[PDB]
Design a protein around this ligand. Structure first.
Ligand SMILES: [Zn+2]
Lengths: 208, 298, 173, 103
C-alpha cells in the first residue's frame, strides 16, 4: 500500500465517529490495503475504542495483528465480514505463517485458514501472489507451499525489540565471518613466509 | 591528472610514427596500458564466445616504451586460432567501423589485435605468431593481446597477456623468467615450439576521474553480486575438462617412471594443485554465504 | 560415562598392584565392564588369564562369565536370564543392571534395523520383557502392531574455513 | 552502425538510447520521439556526470503517451533497475575498482 494510505488518511483526518466506523469497513474491503498501522494509530480511531463502535476497532486490531483463526474464535463479538474481507484476512494469515517458516505444508494452511479442499487454498495463494502480497511457488506432490517473499503487516511497538534481537544476531554473525577472514588471510601469509624462509635455509646448505 | 591520458595529440602521434624508435630496439615496447573500458569490453567479448575463440581490433596510441589501448571492437571473422591473419577477412569491416568511429569522435587508430584462449591460458600459438609477425612487418606499431575468459572466472583474477614477436632470425637476450601457466596436452607441443619467438609486455590498467567516481557509487549496490556469485557451477565443465587433461598428464608421468619431459610429475602436481586450489576457493565463497545467510535462525 | 573411568582405573590396578596376580573383586569388575562395552575379545582373554585358584575360590566370577557365554553365543533370552541370577552388591550388581539396560537398547536398535516384520513373541524374547509390555511399548513408540497373526512391523529410524585454509596452504606452500 | 553491430552481436537488438545531464527535459522528449521512429518502445537512460549526491547518478525511463487538456503528449515514467550478474564482468569491475598468497 502507498496511494491508499494518503487517500484514506485525508479522509481519516476529516471524519467523525460513525463515518470512521464505516470507513473501517471500507478500508478492509479494498484491494491493495494490507497494512493499517497509520490508520490504527490515529486519535480519531482511538476514540472509537471502548465506545459505541468497539468491535470495529477490535476487527481492525485482528486485521493489523491477528489471524483468521483469531477472528473465528471471536466471531460472535466481531462484526460480520464479506468473502473479500475473509479472503484478505486469510492472505494475511498466510503471511504470518510465511513469516514463521519458509516451507508451509497444506495441512497447516487448511487448518489455519479453515478450508475444505486443496484448490480453494491454491486459488487463495494465487490471489495472494496476484495482489503482490506473497511470492513463491506451490508443490503439489509433496503438498507444500514454497515461500520466496512475504510482506510486513504487524507493527508491534512493544515487541519491536525482537526485530533488533535478530538484526544484532545477524550483525554478530557478520562480525564473526569478517574476523574469520582476517585470521585465515593472516594464516595464509604466516604459512607462506615461513615456508619461503625454510626453503631459504635448505638453499643455504647447498653451498656446504 | 587522472584524465591527461585521454587527451589525443595527433601531431605528436604522427611525429612518433615518423621517428620509428622501435626499429632501433626489438625490446623497445615494454609496457601495455589498457583502459578499464577496453579491458571490460574485451573480457565481455571473450566470455560471449564461450568455449570458442573470438577476436577483435584494439584502438589506441603509443607513448615512449608504452603501448596504450583506449578501446576495442569485435571482428566478424571465422578461423581465429586456425587461420593465419584471420583478421584480414574483416578488412572492409575494419575500414568502415573506424570511419564511422571517427564520425562520433573516436580519434585513436589501430594499435593491435586481441583474441581469446578459453580455458588454455595466455600465450601465442604458431598461427598467432605468424599473424603477429605479419602485423609487425606491415602495421607497426602493433601488439597482440590474449585473454582467457574461463580462467578469469575460475581464478577470480583477470587472465590477460600482451605480447610482441621477434623478427625472423633474431635471438632474445639472456633474461627470461617466464611466469608459469598450465597448458593442456593438446596445446603444449605448439606452445613449446613457439614460446621463445615472442615476449610479454608489462600490463597495467587505467580509468578516468568519472570512472573512478561511478565505480565507487556502483559498488554501493554491486556488493550484493559478490555475495551471490555461485562460481562453482557457472563454468563447472572447465574444471572437469582440466581434470581429464590432468589424468592424461599423469598417465604420461607414469610412463616416464616406467622405464625411461623434464619431470612430468612435478608439472602435473602443480596443475592438480592449481585446479584444486580454485575449487576450494569456490567452496570458501559458498561456505561464507552459508555462514552469513543460513546460520541465523529466529 | 562414569563406568569408563572405573574401567581405566581397574585397567591400571590390573598391573600396578600385583605381584603377578591381581585382586579378585577388581577381576570381577573388569570382566563385567568388559561385557558392558561388548568387547568380547577383551573379556574372553581376561577370563583365560584368571588362575584356577580364584576360579575355584570365587564362584561369583564364574557366574559373571556365564552371562558372557550367552553374549558370545548372542542368545538374548539367555543373557536376560543369566543377568538376573547372581547378586554381588556394591561391586558387580550396580553395573549388571547397566548391562541389562544396555542389552535392551542394543536389542531394540537391532530389531528396528534388521526386521521389517517380526513375530511378537520372538521380539519379546529378544528384549527380555513379556509380550504385553513389549507390544505396549512399541505401540506407544510408533511401530505397526498386528493382532491375530501376532506380527509386529517395526519402523526404521573457524570450524570449516580453517580446514580449507590448511588444504590450500598445503597445495600452494 | 546497426548493419555493423549485427555481424558480431547477432543475438542483440536496439533497446533505446542514452544521454548525459540532470532530470529529463523537452529536448530529451524531442529526441526520444525520433528514436521512436526506429523502434516501438525504446528505453531512455540518463547519466549525470556532474552529480552532487551520494547515489549512482543513472536513471532509466519509459515513454507514455497521455492526453492533457485535449493535447496528446509524450511523457517519461522512471523505471527501477538492477545491475547485471555476469561473473567475468564482476571480476573485471572489481579488478578495475581495486587497481593495486592465493587465499
Ligand atoms: Zn591464440
Amino acid at each position: 500500500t502507498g496511494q491508499n494510505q494518503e487517500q484514506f488518511l485525508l479522509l481519516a483526518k476529516s471524519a467523525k465517529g460513525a463515518a470512521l466506523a464505516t470507513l473501517i469497513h471500507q478500508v478492509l474491503e479494498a484491494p491493495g490495503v494490507y497494512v493499517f498501522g497509520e490508520l490504527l494509530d490515529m486519535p480519531n480511531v482511538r476514540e472509537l475504542a471502548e465506545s459505541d463502535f468497539a468491535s470495529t476497532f477490535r476487527l481492525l486490531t485482528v486485521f493489523a495483528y491477528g489471524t483468521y483463526a483469531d477472528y473465528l474464535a471471536e466471531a460472535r463479538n466481531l462484526p460480520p465480514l464479506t468473502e473479500a474481507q475473509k479472503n484478505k484476512l486469510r492472505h494475511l494469515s498466510v503471511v504470518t505463517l510465511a513469516a514463521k517458516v519458509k516451507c508451509i505444508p497444506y495441512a497447516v494452511l487448511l487448518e489455519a485458514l479453515a478450508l475444505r479442499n486443496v484448490r480453494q487454498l491454491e486459488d487463495l495463494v494465487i490471489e495472494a501472489v496476484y495482489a503482490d502480497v506473497l511470492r513463491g511457488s506451490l508443490d503439489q506432490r509433496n503438498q507444500r507451499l514454497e515461500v520466496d517473499y512475504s510482506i510486513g503487516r504487524d507493527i508491534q511497538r512493544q515487541d519491536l525489540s525482537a526485530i533488533a534481537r535478530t538484526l544484532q544476531e545477524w550483525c554478530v554473525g557478520c562480525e564473526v565471518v569478517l574476523s574469520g577472514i582476517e585470521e585465515q588471510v593472516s594464516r595464509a601469509n604466516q604459512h607462506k613466509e615461513q615456508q619461503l624462509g625454510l626453503k631459504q635455509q635448505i638453499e643455504s646448505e647447498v653451498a656446504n | 591528472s587522472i584524465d591527461e591520458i585521454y587527451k589525443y595529440d595527433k601531431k605528436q602521434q604522427q611525429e612518433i610514427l615518423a621517428a620509428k624508435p622501435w626499429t632501433k630496439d626489438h625490446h623497445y615496447f615494454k609496457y601495455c596500458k589498457i583502459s578499464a573500458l577496453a579491458l571490460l569490453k574485451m573480457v565481455m567479448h571473450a566470455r560471449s564466445g564461450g568455449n570458442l575463440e573470438v577476436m577483435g581490433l584494439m584502438l589506441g596510441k603509443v607513448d615512449g616504451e608504452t603501448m596504450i589501448i583506449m578501446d576495442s571492437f569485435a571482428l566478424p571473422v571465422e578461423g581465429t586460432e586456425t587461420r593465419v591473419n584471420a583478421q584480414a577477412a574483416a578488412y572492409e569491416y575494419m575500414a568502415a567501423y573506424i570511419e564511422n568511429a571517427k564520425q562520433v569522435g573516436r580519434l585513436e587508430n589501430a594499435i593491435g589485435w586481441y583474441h581469446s584462449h578459453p580455458g588454455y591460458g595466455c600465450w601465442l600459438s604458431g598461427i598467432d605468431v605468424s599473424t603477429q609477425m605479419l602485423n609487425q612487418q606491415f602495421q607497426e606499431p602493433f601488439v597482440a593481446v590474449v585473454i582467457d575468459p574461463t580462467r578469469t572466472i575460475s581464478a577470480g583474477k583477470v587472465n590477460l597477456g600482451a605480447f610482441r614477436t621477434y623478427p625472423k632470425g633474431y635471438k632474445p637476450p639472456d633474461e627470461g623468467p617466464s611466469e608459469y601457466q598450465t597448458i593442456p596436452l593438446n596445446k603444449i607441443e605448439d606452445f613449446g615450439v613457439h614460446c621463445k619467438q615472442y615476449y610479454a609486455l608489462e600490463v597495467s590498467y587505467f580509468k578516468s576521474s568519472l570512472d573512478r567516481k561511478l565505480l565507487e557509487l556502483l559498488w554501493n549496490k554491486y556488493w550484493v553480486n559478490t555475495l551471490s556469485s555461485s562460481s562453482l557451477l557457472t563454468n563447472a565443465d572447465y574444471t572437469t575438462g582440466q581434470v581429464f587433461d590432468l589424468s592424461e598428464k599423469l598417465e604420461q608421468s607414469e610412463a616416464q617412471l616406467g622405464r625411461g619431459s623434464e619431470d612430468k610429475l612435478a608439472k602435473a602436481t602443480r596443475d592438480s594443485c592449481k585446479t584444486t586450489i580454485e575449487a576450494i576457493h569456490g567452496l570458501m565463497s559458498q561456505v561464507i554465504k552459508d555462514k552469513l545467510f543460513n546460520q541465523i535462525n529466529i | 560415562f562414569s563406568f569408563k573411568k572405573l574401567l581405566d582405573q581397574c585397567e591400571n590396578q590390573e598391573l600396578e598392584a600385583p605381584g603377578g596376580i591381581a585382586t579378585p573383586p577388581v577381576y570381577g569388575q573388569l570382566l563385567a565392564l568388559y561385557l558392558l562395552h561388548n568387547d568380547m575379545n577383551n573379556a574372553r582373554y581376561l577370563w583365560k588369564r584368571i588362575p584356577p585358584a580364584i576360579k575355584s575360590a570365587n564362584s561369583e566370577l564364574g557366574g559373571i562369565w556365564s552371562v558372557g557365554q550367552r553374549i558370545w553365543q548372542r542368545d538374548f533370552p539367555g543373557i536376560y536370564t543369566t543377568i538376573n541370577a547372581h547378586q554381588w552388591s556394591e561391586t558387580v550388581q550396580p553395573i549388571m543392571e547397566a548391562l541389562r539396560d544396555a542389552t535392551r537398547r542394543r536389542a531394540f536398535a537391532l530389531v528396528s534395523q534388521a526386521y521389517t516384520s517380526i513375530i511378537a513373541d520372538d521380539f519379546a524374547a529378544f528384549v527380555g520383557l513379556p509380550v504385553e509390555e513389549a507390544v505396549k511399548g512399541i505401540l506407544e513408540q510408533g511401530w505397526q502392531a498386528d493382532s491375530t497373526t501376532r506380527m509386529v512391523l517395526p519402523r526404521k529410524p573457524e570450524q570449516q574455513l580453517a580446514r580449507l585454509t590448511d588444504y590450500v596452504a598445503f597445495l600452494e606452500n | 552502425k546497426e548493419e555493423q553491430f549485427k555481424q558480431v552481436f547477432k543475438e542483440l537488438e536496439f533497446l533505446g538510447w542514452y544521454t548525459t545531464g540532470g532530470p529529463p527535459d523537452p529536448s530529451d522528449i524531442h529526441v526520444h520521439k525520433q528514436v521512436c521512429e526506429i523502434i516501438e518502445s525504446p528505453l531512455f537512460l540518463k547519466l549525470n556526470p556532474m552529480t552532487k549526491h551520494t547515489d549512482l547518478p543513472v536513471s532509466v525511463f519509459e515513454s507514455v503517451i497521455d492526453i492533457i487538456n485535449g493535447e496528446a503528449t509524450m511523457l517519461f515514467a522512471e523505471l527501477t533497475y538492477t545491475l547485471a550478474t555476469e561473473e567475468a564482468e564482476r571480476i573485471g569491475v572489481d579488478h578495475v575498482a581495486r587497481m593495486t598468497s592465493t587465499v
